Scaffold this active site. Structure first.
Site, PDB file in Angstrom:
ATOM      1  N   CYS A  94     -16.343  62.453   5.640  1.00  0.00           N
ATOM      2  CA  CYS A  94     -16.257  61.876   4.195  1.00  0.00           C
ATOM      3  C   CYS A  94     -14.956  60.820   4.508  1.00  0.00           C
ATOM      4  O   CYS A  94     -14.184  60.935   4.490  1.00  0.00           O
ATOM      5  CB  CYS A  94     -15.434  62.892   2.996  1.00  0.00           C
ATOM      6  SG  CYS A  94     -15.705  62.061   1.930  1.00  0.00           S
ATOM      7  N   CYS A 114     -12.715  59.842   2.032  1.00  0.00           N
ATOM      8  CA  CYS A 114     -11.917  60.292   1.522  1.00  0.00           C
ATOM      9  C   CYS A 114     -11.249  61.844   1.575  1.00  0.00           C
ATOM     10  O   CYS A 114     -10.603  61.844   3.293  1.00  0.00           O
ATOM     11  CB  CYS A 114     -12.043  61.149  -0.504  1.00  0.00           C
ATOM     12  SG  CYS A 114     -13.429  61.653  -0.836  1.00  0.00           S
ATOM     13  N   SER A 115     -12.391  62.706   2.053  1.00  0.00           N
ATOM     14  CA  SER A 115     -11.698  63.936   2.620  1.00  0.00           C
ATOM     15  C   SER A 115     -13.153  65.474   1.117  1.00  0.00           C
ATOM     16  O   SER A 115     -13.297  66.748   2.061  1.00  0.00           O
ATOM     17  CB  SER A 115     -10.624  65.289   2.000  1.00  0.00           C
ATOM     18  OG  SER A 115     -10.583  64.678   0.844  1.00  0.00           O
ATOM     19  N   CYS A 116     -14.452  64.666   1.124  1.00  0.00           N
ATOM     20  CA  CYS A 116     -15.379  65.702   0.133  1.00  0.00           C
ATOM     21  C   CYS A 116     -15.660  67.024   1.879  1.00  0.00           C
ATOM     22  O   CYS A 116     -15.924  66.444   3.031  1.00  0.00           O
ATOM     23  CB  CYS A 116     -16.070  64.586   0.427  1.00  0.00           C
ATOM     24  SG  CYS A 116     -15.999  63.829  -0.844  1.00  0.00           S
TER      25      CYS A 116
END
Ligand SMILES: [Co+2]
Lengths: 203, 228
Positions: free
Chosen positions: A107, A110-112
């Site tokens: 991701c 971000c951090s999905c």
């Protein structure tokens, strides 16, 4: 990396703790946050939801060709057969590793991450180092960081989760596991094998 | 926005810091930061897309080196101030109070069963972004498309590394909440979603891996037809 402008980890932790408790006190007074709500959320992701769930999906696919087809056709619906799904995994698309292809997920924005099958992501997955480099030098990254050498002839497909579609890797079944039970096979499925940074455990 | 957070393709960020193992929560404040997500969402501070935008507007230097959950705290404060639900001055006063008295108690409060119900429902039922639209999909598998070169100052899911690049539609997933409107407080305005394949050579030029591709999700307005 070194930054002469940065405070110590101790001072940083002390500052953050105070700021969070302050914000926490305000949300509590507003009636939108409670101690039980905090404890429940923590309890779920510390003991209930984790990579052992994704491992169950992987071993079912390895031992059930029909389920494997359903899994690759619609990840969300397939995982629901095992009572697996929910928050940040509403839309899942599983991708299969083969002799000709290797998948790795990220991701970059971000951090999905697919929480229902893997739980919360490890810190390195959420950090700038992995995110920036994997879409640009995947082969070098896998070898240098994870000791996983993917042949130059073998295609590496990097899946960047820019939408709510969550990508999950179905790693290849390790050789020498003919006839193993789903429970035995699960010991070979790691969180890393489902992100694509490492293959499932050998032997 | 052209924020530093959009790190895909950025060089010089350094080696990966990866411990052999780690706990889900490294400190008590992290559990609180985490739980504040469903709390602020239910309270109307923001939706998921707005949540991301708040983080994207962080001081880049702070973003790049701060503990992950601190990013979440920044977006809560951002939206709390935006919606007028959080008074910054009072927050600053309370921060100093807890700096000086870290073990001071939290405000007396009643527990609420509705909040636990919300947590269980959100966790096990999820918060699906899939929506139905009246328009049929403009693209289909096999179509060769080009990613927009637009550079919105507000929220969007347009990584700088894919802009202006040409790829092939891999799959149509149906319609979903559109980030360009949702993250900017302009509503869901659902758009069809597609996974598009871009070769490493197309993305990085000669410095790209000759046998690698990147799959990136594009909402309908993000791409235009090159070859059917
Ligand atoms: Co993300």
């Amino acid at each position: 990396t070194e930054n002469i402008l940065r405070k110590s980890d101790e001072e940083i932790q002390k500052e953050i703790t105070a700021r969070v408790k302050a914000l926490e006190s305000m949300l509590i007074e507003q009636g939108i946050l409670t101690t039980s709500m905090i404890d429940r959320m923590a309890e779920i992701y510390e003991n209930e939801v984790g990579p052992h769930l994704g491992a169950k999906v992987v071993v079912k696919a390895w031992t059930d060709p029909e389920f494997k087809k359903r899994l690759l056709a619609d990840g969300t619906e397939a995982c629901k057969e095992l009572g697996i799904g929910g928050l940040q995994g509403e839309d899942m698309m599983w991708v299969e590793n083969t002799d000709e292809v290797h998948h790795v997920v990220v991701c970059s924005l971000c951090s999905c991450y697919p929480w229902p099958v893997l739980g919360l992501p490890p810190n390195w997955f959420k950090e700038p180092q992995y995110r920036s480099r994997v879409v640009r030098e995947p082969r070098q990254l896998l070898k240098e960081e994870f000791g996983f050498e993917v042949p130059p002839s073998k295609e590496i497909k990097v899946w960047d989760s820019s939408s709510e579609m969550r990508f999950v890797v179905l790693p290849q079944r390790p050789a020498g596991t003919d006839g193993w039970s789903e429970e035995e096979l699960a010991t070979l499925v790691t969180r890393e094998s489902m992100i694509g940074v490492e293959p499932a455990k050998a032997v | 926005m052209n924020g530093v957070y959009d790190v895909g393709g950025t060089d010089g960020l350094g080696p990966i810091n990866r411990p052999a193992d780690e706990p889900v929560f490294r400190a008590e404040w992290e559990k609180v930061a985490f739980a504040m997500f469903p709390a602020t969402f239910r309270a109307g501070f923001m939706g998921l897309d707005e949540f991301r935008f708040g983080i994207e507007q962080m001081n880049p230097a702070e973003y790049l080196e701060s503990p992950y959950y601190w990013h979440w705290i920044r977006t809560y404060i951002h939206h709390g101030v935006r919606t007028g639900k959080i008074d910054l001055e009072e927050l600053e006063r309370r921060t100093q109070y807890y700096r000086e008295n870290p073990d001071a108690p939290l405000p007396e409060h009643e527990q609420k069963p509705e909040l636990i119900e919300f947590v269980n429902q959100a966790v096990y039922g999820g918060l699906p972004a899939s929506r139905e639209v009246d328009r049929p999909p403009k693209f289909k598998e096999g179509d060769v498309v080009r990613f927009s070169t637009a550079s919105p100052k507000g929220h969007a899911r347009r990584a700088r590394y894919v802009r202006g690049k040409t790829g092939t539609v891999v799959k149509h997933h149906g319609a979903y909440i559109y980030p360009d409107t949702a993250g900017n407080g302009l509503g869901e305005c659902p758009e069809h979603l597609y996974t598009v394949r871009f070769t490493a050579q197309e993305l990085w030029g000669p410095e790209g891996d000759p046998n690698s591709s990147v799959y990136y999700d594009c909402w309908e307005p993000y791409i235009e037809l090159v070859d059917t």
